[PDB]
């Protein structure tokens, strides 16, 4: 939105009047204001001639980024920002789909080390927290305050005053304090917020990459279950990575934005350990695995009938399978072999991940929804940017 606007803020003063209506007649097409053809002069304008080519090719996201690139700026990475930045405080908000907590781990590791994750949970966490805050600034280690918004009542009383008082934090050793927000969620105090630097972690992983990150931790659990279970836990890693993938794209996809957690996987995996612990390892237990996963574990949140069916139809495909599943077009997952090694099967199922390459068309090929839907969604987020820009210009 700021790209398209800022581009119009410069170019309307600088370029021709013939330019102004041409680009606005284009922003009108991306929006639902109008559909028209801009003013053409041979080799009169070429940058502009290139943009309408994006808009006429029905290609939305490309045309939206055009305004960013036309600025010819190197678009700064969290680390770049942090290094340039001249403050000991940062608050990075993000949508509930992700958390930059693990980006901050690799950010600290690659330069200046000193990483300390501090959950704000109960009284003990806040109480331990305030101790580790005052001491890390003397010491100069980096500190993180995970998901402050929840523990907020405390912020306005202790942290609001504490961070304001700490103009001795300027005096204190190289140290940087980080806080994680959620955009959709309770409002942080504006005074504290304006004082501290702000970032938005907009960084979304692919299906395969989330699968590999889900299945990645799973080896640290140890061993209390059968070999066969690791297959079910693998299945779930794919399943979870497929509903989360579907969460962003709405309306086409899910009716509403719904948020699925590490808690949702956990309550699903716990039911899986439980079904194998109670049954024979005959494969057929699969029937009520689906109903419980699709209606209590994951359908708990879901309220609309429309979406409850989507969870179910996903369970139909992810869970019920005999010999061959074919989660995605590229990848077939075969049922545990007679060799029956649990160490081997982890390594086999890890290898199935390492063999596959996530295609160009993932959102339509992998997530069972049509390609036509994806473009419809691309169109809608275009319309939203295009509108809000027009609206901004007319307001001033």
């Amino acid at each position: 939105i700021m790209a398209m606007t800022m581009f119009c803020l410069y170019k309307f003063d600088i370029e021709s009047e013939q330019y102004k209506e041409a680009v606005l007649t284009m922003i009108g097409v991306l929006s639902e204001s109008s559909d028209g053809v801009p003013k053409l002069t041979v080799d009169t304008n070429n940058d502009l001639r290139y943009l309408w080519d994006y808009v006429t090719t029905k290609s939305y996201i490309s045309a939206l980024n055009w305004f960013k690139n036309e600025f010819f700026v190197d678009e700064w990475n969290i680390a770049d920002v942090v290094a340039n930045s001249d403050n000991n405080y940062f608050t990075m908000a993000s949508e509930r789909d992700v958390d930059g907590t693990f980006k901050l781990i690799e950010l600290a590791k690659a330069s200046k080390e000193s990483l300390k994750i501090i959950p704000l949970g109960s009284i003990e966490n806040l109480n331990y927290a305030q101790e580790e805050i005052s001491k890390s600034k003397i010491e100069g280690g980096w500190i993180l305050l995970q998901n402050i918004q929840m523990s907020l009542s405390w912020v306005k009383t202790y942290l609001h005053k504490h961070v304001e008082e700490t103009k001795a934090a300027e005096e204190h050793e190289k140290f940087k304090m980080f806080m994680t927000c959620h955009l959709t969620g309770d409002k942080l105090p504006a005074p504290l917020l304006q004082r501290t630097d702000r970032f938005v972690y907009e960084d979304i992983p692919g299906i395969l990459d989330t699968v590999k990150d889900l299945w990645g931790s799973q080896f640290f659990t140890g061993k209390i279950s059968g070999v066969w279970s690791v297959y079910c836990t693998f299945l779930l890693s794919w399943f979870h990575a497929l509903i989360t993938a579907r969460t962003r794209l709405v309306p086409h996809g899910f009716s509403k934005k719904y948020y699925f957690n590490d808690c949702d996987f956990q309550f699903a995996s716990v039911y899986l350990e439980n079904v194998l612990a109670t049954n024979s390892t005959n494969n057929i237990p699969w029937a009520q695995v689906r109903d419980h996963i699709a209606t209590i574990v994951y359908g708990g949140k879901i309220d609309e009938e429309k979406d409850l069916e989507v969870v179910a139809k996903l369970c139909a495909h992810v869970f019920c399978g005999s010999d061959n599943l074919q989660i995605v077009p590229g990848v077939r997952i075969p049922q545990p072999l007679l060799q029956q090694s649990e160490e081997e099967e982890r390594a086999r199922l890890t290898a199935i991940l390492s063999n596959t390459i996530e295609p160009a068309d993932s959102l339509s090929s992998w997530l069972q929804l049509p390609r036509e839907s994806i473009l419809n969604y691309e169109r809608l987020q275009a319309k939203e940017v295009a509108s809000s820009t027009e609206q901004l210009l007319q307001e001033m």
Partner: protein, 1030 residues
């Protein structure tokens, strides 16, 4: 004495300070100057030392009570004042039973043989007897004796469970067991044997053999109920809820495609197993569902009203157990009336727990909840936050933080958790439940911290079919399965086939109502579809409007056909026709219909709604039916017609007065106390009807929703519930419904009047005869007989028909429909004719007709065109003349009939006017009119209507002289006297009264009881100016 007995060091130190302060005050008062007090020795020193010691006593009591509370953690539920009464009342012992209702929730009072406790009784009425009767002595603490009781009461439930369980296993009839075992116990025994008999039945597939078997127990229990004592009547009914669930599941199982299909269905259900293995018997029962098991704790529940089993219900029970298994809090969000707390309560009962419900933000103290939370974490109970969402942000934060401690304490299993700045221990049997009603914003949220501590679920209304089938089963089924499917399809079908109309509701509440209406109807006919079909048209139809009135008939007979003929066909009808003949009314297709629809509804429904256009016939329908019932039954009726919105909620329901909080009756509650409190006369044999004629709104119905409920009792704002008899029927007549909630509709019976009950002619017919009656009291029968003959021959319906049709083809200021104009005509016509009665004695028969026809043509004009432009009047005048006989006396704009001062004469002349002569000083005078062609014209008509006694609304532009014409016509005459009230945007109904009080004199004449006539003998006129201002 008892409190100072328990605390010796505390009362010895209190009384020592009481001495000092007694001398300090009396010394300081006699000084006689407050300021003089600073000169007094050791006053700041004395009081600072005294307050320190008074604070040491309060603190010491606080340490005593908390040490008392920790010993018996039920006392956490009680609080200080109640707690002290218990320690004080120890001598008595029996006086603690009051407070048990609170600290248990299940029981109401305790049973003694004085020295020994024989058992307890529940709030439901159920009698539980203990195994060992607990012995009581003088030197015993409440803490010690009660703690034994809690133990024994749970043990006593295990006893009554094993005793019973064993019996049924030895093939005993369930009707036998009922009589001897408490419900809680028989329920669990049923569940465990059911479960075991169906568990085996999965392997064998002997389902049919067990099904009929169970079905027989159902029928057996049903017929037992009908002839049973009210107490045990609750117990059988409560068991029925459960038995029906049993059979339903088995039947579902008999049906399954495969064994895997059956083992899926069985996984989803709550399966109640027992350990025939182990010791610690109170831990011997456990429950399975979706793989998860749950230990039945043995708490007494009494006999609570048991929630009917739905698939949706089990799912809720399933999510609750899924949360609990992983040490997470249960939480469901969703619309109010989705019974989220009922579920949490029920899910507790099913596992032998009485869940504590915190009704949150119903002016609820944080201090009390903080105590309750400590109590719950000690006692290991389940607590449910009933609509958690509605808490104020400081409270919400404080509470939400506390709750996290508990849920975090359980998840980790921390032995002691700290909350409310103290180290208190945590039972792991503890759980917190949150119900989240939605806001105006959307479906509510848990605070962030609670999101990773709870599991949220979306409650949804039950797909109705399942609930319907059961309800049909309970009544006396015939074929319950067919009915339930058919009924729902029909209701579903009406919804997609009928017009989307405001007040139409075809959801379950509606079918539960059809089914509720059904019970008496079954008594009439059968436990058959036919009884269903009649109940459908008894409820569905009286609220339908003509287009949808056939959609109902079309699809009802399409989906199920029952019968040819109706009973109570002659009987009521002749009692209805004889009522209207007497009332003046005409028995029309429609009038009969809406009279019948109503008659049959009062029978079932106690709250009735009548919706229609103003002048539908609603007051006439109900007034006519009610009248017909006193002919057919022989029962008197006593009607109270109350304008709902004239009075305030305070004037009507009961107002409590802000400072002295003094309770005074009101209007609605006070007329019930004649019936309830002191039925001194004949009320038992009488029928009481309280009618609300005015527009109905939420605020007013909400304050009496309890009478509309299954309750049939009135809840005071403070300090009572008053029960309502079956005689006492509440009616509601109104013009629209837009304001009311669908909830309010569906508790009552609704009668939508699609069109006016009666024919235009039929209205006039009645109106005439109504007017004649008034005149019999002031006109001789010879005069009257001749004058009513005249009216019949002068105006025939055929002529007027076109005239009333042409009325519409005209601009009408201050719009009022043609039908409602009719009374304005008839009253005028009859009065103008009764005016010239003496000149009808001797006048020519041809000439007489001309006087009649003219007056009727006049009266008819003003009543249809009087509110018209008069440019339009003049237009209408030719229209009237047109449709009346051509030769008959024509109407002119200024047309009038005249007679001589000193000799009887007869001629028709118009527009003869006085001239006014007035001096210079007289020029402006607040009562001065320069008579015009139009002054006389208006003053004449205006005065004529008052002689009719019909109220007059004068509409027009400012300064047009509506006020002048009105005032001058009346400041002149002896008959009437004027009082002017000027209305503004916000004028009160007292303003009307206050203004009247100067010119009105109340007299208690036995003829009308209290009367408010005018302070002098001759008539009064209130002039209400700017009536469309308030």
């Amino acid at each position: 004495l008892d409190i100072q007995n328990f605390l010796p060091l505390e009362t010895s130190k209190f009384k020592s300070l009481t001495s000092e302060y007694k001398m300090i005050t009396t010394r300081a008062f006699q000084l006689d100057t407050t300021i003089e007090v600073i000169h007094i020795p050791n006053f700041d020193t004395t009081l600072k030392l005294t307050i320190d010691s008074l604070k040491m006593i309060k603190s010491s009591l606080s340490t005593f009570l908390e040490r008392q509370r920790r010993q018996f953690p039920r006392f956490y539920f009680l609080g200080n004042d109640d707690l002290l009464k218990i320690i004080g009342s120890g001598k008595h012992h029996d006086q603690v039973s009051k407070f048990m209702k609170k600290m248990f929730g299940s029981i109401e009072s305790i049973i003694f043989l004085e020295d020994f406790i024989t058992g307890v009784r529940s709030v439901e009425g159920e009698v539980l007897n203990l195994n060992e009767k607990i012995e009581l002595k003088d030197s015993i603490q409440a803490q010690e004796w009660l703690n034994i009781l809690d133990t024994e009461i749970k043990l006593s439930v295990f006893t009554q469970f094993r005793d019973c369980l064993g019996q049924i296993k030895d093939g005993t009839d369930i009707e036998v067991v009922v009589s001897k075992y408490i419900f809680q116990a028989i329920l669990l025994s049923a569940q465990v044997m059911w479960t075991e008999l169906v568990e085996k039945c999965l392997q064998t597939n002997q389902f049919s053999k067990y099904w009929k078997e169970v079905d027989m127990k159902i029928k057996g229990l049903l017929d037992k109920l009908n002839k049973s004592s009210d107490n045990v009547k609750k117990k059988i009914e409560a068991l029925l809820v459960e038995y029906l669930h049993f059979n339903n599941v088995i039947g579902q199982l008999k049906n399954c495609s495969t064994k895997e299909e059956a083992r899926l269905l069985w996984a989803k259900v709550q399966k109640f197993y027992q350990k025939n293995d182990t010791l610690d018997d109170l831990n011997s029962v456990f429950i399975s569902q979706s793989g998860y098991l749950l230990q039945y704790k043995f708490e007494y529940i009494g006999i609570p009203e048991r929630l009917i089993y739905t698939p949706l219900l089990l799912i809720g029970f399933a999510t609750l157990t899924d949360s609990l298994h992983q040490k997470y809090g249960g939480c469901f969000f969703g619309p109010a009336g989705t019974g989220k707390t009922e579920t949490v309560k029920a899910f507790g009962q099913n596992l032998g727990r009485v869940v504590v419900v915190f009704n949150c933000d119903d002016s609820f103290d944080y201090q009390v909840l903080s105590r309750l939370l400590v109590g719950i974490t000690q006692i290991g109970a389940w607590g449910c936050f009933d609509e958690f969402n509605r808490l104020d942000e400081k409270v919400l934060s404080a509470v939400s933080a506390n709750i996290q401690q508990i849920q975090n304490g359980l998840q980790v299993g921390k032995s002691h958790i700290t909350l409310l700045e103290e180290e208190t221990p945590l039972s792991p049997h503890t759980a917190v439940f949150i119900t989240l009603n939605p806001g105006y914003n959307g479906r509510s949220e848990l605070p962030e911290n609670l999101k990773k501590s709870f599991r949220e679920f979306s409650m949804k209304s039950p797909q109705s079919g399942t609930i319907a089938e059961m309800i049909l089963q309970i009544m006396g089924f015939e074929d319950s399965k067919s009915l339930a499917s058919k009924i729902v399809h029909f209701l579903e079908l009406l919804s997609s086939k009928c017009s989307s109309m405001n007040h139409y509701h075809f959801g379950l509440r509606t079918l539960k109502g059809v089914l509720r209406n059904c019970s008496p109807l079954i008594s009439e006919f059968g436990e058959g579809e036919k009884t269903v079909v009649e109940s459908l048209k008894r409820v569905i139809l009286p609220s339908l409007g003509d287009t949808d009135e056939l959609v109902f008939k079309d699809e009802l007979s399409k989906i199920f056909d029952s019968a040819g003929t109706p009973l109570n066909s002659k009987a009521i009808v002749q009692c209805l026709k004889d009522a209207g003949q007497r009332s003046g009314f005409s028995m029309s297709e429609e009038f009969l219909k809406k009279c019948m629809q109503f008659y049959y509804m009062q029978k079932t429904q106690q709250a009735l709604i009548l919706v229609g256009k103003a002048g539908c016939g609603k007051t006439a329908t109900w007034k006519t039916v009610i009248d017909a019932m006193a002919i057919f039954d022989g029962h008197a009726n006593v009607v109270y017609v109350i304008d709902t919105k004239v009075l305030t909620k305070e004037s009507l329901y009961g107002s409590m007065l802000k400072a002295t909080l003094e309770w005074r009756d009101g209007l609605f509650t006070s007329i019930l106390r004649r019936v309830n409190d002191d039925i001194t006369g004949t009320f038992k044999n009488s029928r009481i009807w309280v009618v609300f004629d005015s527009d109905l709104d939420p605020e007013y119905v909400e304050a009496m929703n309890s009478v509309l409920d299954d309750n049939k009792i009135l809840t005071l704002p403070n300090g009572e519930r008053l029960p309502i008899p079956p005689n006492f029927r509440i009616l509601f007549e109104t013009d629209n419904l837009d304001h009311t909630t669908p909830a309010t509709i569906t508790r009552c019976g609704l009668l939508w009047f699609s069109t006016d009950v009666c024919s235009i002619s039929s209205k006039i017919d009645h109106l005439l005869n109504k007017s004649y009656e008034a005149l019999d009291n002031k006109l001789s029968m010879f005069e009257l007989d001749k004058l009513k003959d005249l009216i019949s021959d002068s105006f025939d319906m055929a002529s007027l028909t076109n005239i009333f049709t042409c009325s519409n083809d005209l601009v009408h200021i201050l719009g009022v429909r043609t039908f409602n104009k009719l009374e304005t005509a008839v009253q005028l016509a009859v009065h103008l004719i009764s005016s010239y009665r003496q000149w009808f004695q001797n006048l020519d028969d041809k000439s007489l007709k001309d006087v009649i026809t003219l007056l009727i043509k006049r009266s008819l004009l003003y009543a249809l065109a009087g509110d018209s432009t008069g440019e339009s009047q003049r237009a209408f005048i030719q229209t009237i003349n047109t449709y009346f006989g051509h030769d008959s006396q024509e109407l002119s704009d200024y047309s009038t009939i005249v007679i001589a001062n000193d000799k009887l004469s007869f001629s028709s002349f118009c527009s003869e006017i006085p001239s006014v002569s007035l001096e210079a000083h007289e020029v402006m005078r607040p009562d001065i009119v320069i008579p015009t062609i139009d002054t006389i014209k208006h003053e004449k008509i205006f005065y004529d209507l008052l002689n009719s006694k019909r109220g007059i609304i004068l509409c027009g532009p400012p300064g047009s002289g509506k006020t002048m014409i009105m005032n001058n016509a009346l400041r002149n005459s002896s008959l009437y006297d004027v009082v002017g009230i000027n209305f503004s945007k916000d004028t009160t109904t007292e303003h009307i009264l206050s203004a009247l009080h100067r010119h009105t004199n109340y007299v208690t004449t036995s003829k009308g009881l209290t009367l408010l006539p005018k302070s002098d003998i001759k008539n009064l006129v209130l002039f209400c100016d700017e009536i469309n201002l308030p």
